[PDB]
Amino acid sequence: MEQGEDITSKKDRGVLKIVKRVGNGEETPMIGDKVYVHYKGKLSNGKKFDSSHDRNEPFVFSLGKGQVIKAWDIGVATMKKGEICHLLCKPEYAYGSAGSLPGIPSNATLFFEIELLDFKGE
Numbered sequence: 001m002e003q004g005e006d007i008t009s010k011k012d013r014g015v016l017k018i019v020k021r022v023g024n025g026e027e028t029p030m031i032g033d034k035v036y037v038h039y040k041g042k043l044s045n046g047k048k049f050d051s052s053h054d055r056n057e058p059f060v061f062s063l064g065k066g067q068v069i070k071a072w073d074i075g076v077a078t079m080k081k082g083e084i085c086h087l088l089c090k091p092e093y094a095y096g097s098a099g100s101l102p103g104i105p106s107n108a109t110l111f112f113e114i115e116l117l118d119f120k121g122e
Contacts (some may be wrong), residue, residue: 016087036059089110
């Protein structure tokens with residue numbers, strides 16, 4: 001039984017996490033860390049709207065700086081190196097009413113698969 005963990009501060013089930021592969025040790029990235037991920041995102045219809053693998057390149061960002069949707073700044077901060085999770089993201093924690101068009105509609109829930117490849121201090 002794989003139940004989603006609500007990892008929001010407001011506990012409004014806006015970001016739900018399920019671990020699919022356990023990572024190494026207990027360390028998680030800190031705000032400001034450079035993080036390296038592979039990911040896939042699907043819309044509710046099951047079609048991919050995004051994927052780093054489809055670009056053949058890991059995605060890199062600084063954690064906690066708003067360089068990614070809120071759901072990722074929250075979610076990746078909970079991941080161990082080597083961890084794979086699924087992350088369900090309500091639009092309020094993603095692209096909201098604006099969307100990111102044309103690929104991500106307004107008011108869309110996003111369904112991610114994320115692998116935390118590595119992270120390091122700023």
